[PDB]
Ligand binder design. Structure first.
Ligand SMILES: Nc1ncnc2c1ncn2[C@@H]1O[C@H](COP(=O)(O)OP(=O)(O)OP(=O)(O)O)[C@@H](O)[C@H]1O
Ligand SMILES: CC(C)c1ccccc1-c1ccc(C[NH3+])cc1Cl
Length: 325
């Protein structure tokens, strides 16, 4: 069978805490008063959620209400417990309240409001220092949730809210987040296609916090090279081929051999043979203002097939790319 693996950092943080911390199924959810909130307008619509701007009538504070389609109760309990555990963490979205709709029995999470601006609109005003600054803010959030024995498992631009005016960043959407337990085999059907790590794509279940560091690398690559998404797969199999076209096929086969992974037969038909590309090959006149040798060295240390070989969030914080922050 596959070779076992464990996180290089925060390995046993959940083993040493009482069951109450990580046993989300036993968590008792208590509802606030839905009448304390007046819906203003629709902001977005997720996979299993509708998002509204609202105001807390009791204190005239603007909030965001995430109305959840109750498809899986266990999943709701998991998101709530994690948000409760991480509440007050650096750059972690604050869960302010949990409420229910009496008539339709619909649960809703209430969050602090963030005056967000999308990636496409943000890029034009972003300087090299700004990317270093915000990347460091994401790292503080990841080092914090990893230290708390939690893997985010859905790191992507749509899950990072940025109020550029106030230079305020918040890591959101903890619906796919999970507690890390060494030796545990997790569901690989997590993260969004473009950000899925190689461990997910080759069905290696014993993954850890390093999954988020791959997703962070995908984000950095799309910014510094202005290629969104960086690895543009059309399905989960094709996603690995797009990674192999950059990282080369040699290091991929070294990875599957190292962990004794049984690669799906479909890959022989589509994977092929690819050289390992130099990161400098993606530099052009439109994107060169956000590229530096430090940026490329840093990217090289995140975007590695071997999940054990990627920088942890704390190691990433110590990289020369962030000496200016
Ligand atoms: N605090 C917030 N401020 C603004 N939009 C938010 C906030 N929290 C979640 N969202 C939006 O709702 C969705 C959350 O999942 C995303 O589409 C995101 O844009
Ligand atoms: C600077 C920032 C951390 C970043 C780096 C790499 C890729 C994208 C982004 C990014 C993330 C979220 C949002 C707002 N939803 C906007 C942007 Cl520009």
């Amino acid at each position: 069978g596959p070779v076992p693996s464990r996180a290089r950092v925060y390995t046993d943080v959940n083993t040493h805490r009482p069951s109450e911390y990580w046993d989300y199924e036993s968590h008792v959810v208590e509802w606030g008063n839905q009448d304390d909130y007046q819906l203003v307008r629709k902001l977005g619509r997720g996979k299993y959620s509708e998002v509204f701007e609202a105001i807390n009538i009791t204190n005239n504070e603007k909030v965001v209400v995430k109305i959840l389609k109750p498809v899986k109760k266990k999943k709701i309990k998991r998101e709530i417990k994690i948000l409760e555990n991480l509440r007050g963490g650096p750059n972690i979205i604050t869960l302010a309240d949990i409420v229910k709709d009496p008539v339709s029995r619909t649960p809703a999470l209430v969050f602090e409001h963030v005056n967000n601006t999308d990636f496409k609109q943000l890029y034009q005003t972003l300087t090299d220092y700004d990317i270093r600054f915000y990347m460091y803010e994401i790292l503080k959030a990841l080092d914090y949730c990893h230290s708390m024995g939690i893997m985010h498992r859905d790191v992507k631009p749509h899950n990072v809210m940025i109020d550029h005016e106030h230079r305020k960043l918040r890591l959101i959407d903890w619906g796919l987040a999970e507690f890390y337990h060494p030796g545990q085999e997790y569901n690989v059907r997590v993260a969004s296609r473009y950000f899925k790590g190689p461990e997910l794509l080759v069905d290696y279940q014993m993954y850890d916090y390093s999954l988020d560091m791959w997703s962070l690398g995908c984000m950095l690559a799309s910014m510094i090279f202005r290629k969104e998404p960086f690895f543009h797969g059309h399905d989960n199999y094709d996603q690995l081929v797009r990674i192999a076209k950059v990282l080369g096929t040699e290091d991929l086969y070294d990875y599957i051999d190292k962990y004794n992974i049984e690669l799906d037969p479909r890959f022989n038909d589509i994977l092929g043979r690819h050289s390992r590309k130099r990161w400098e090959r993606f530099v052009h006149s439109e994107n060169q203002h956000l590229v530096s040798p430090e940026a490329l060295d840093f990217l090289d240390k995140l975007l590695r097939y071997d999940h054990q070989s990627r920088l942890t969030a704390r190691e990433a914080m110590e990289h020369p790319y962030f000496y200016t922050v």
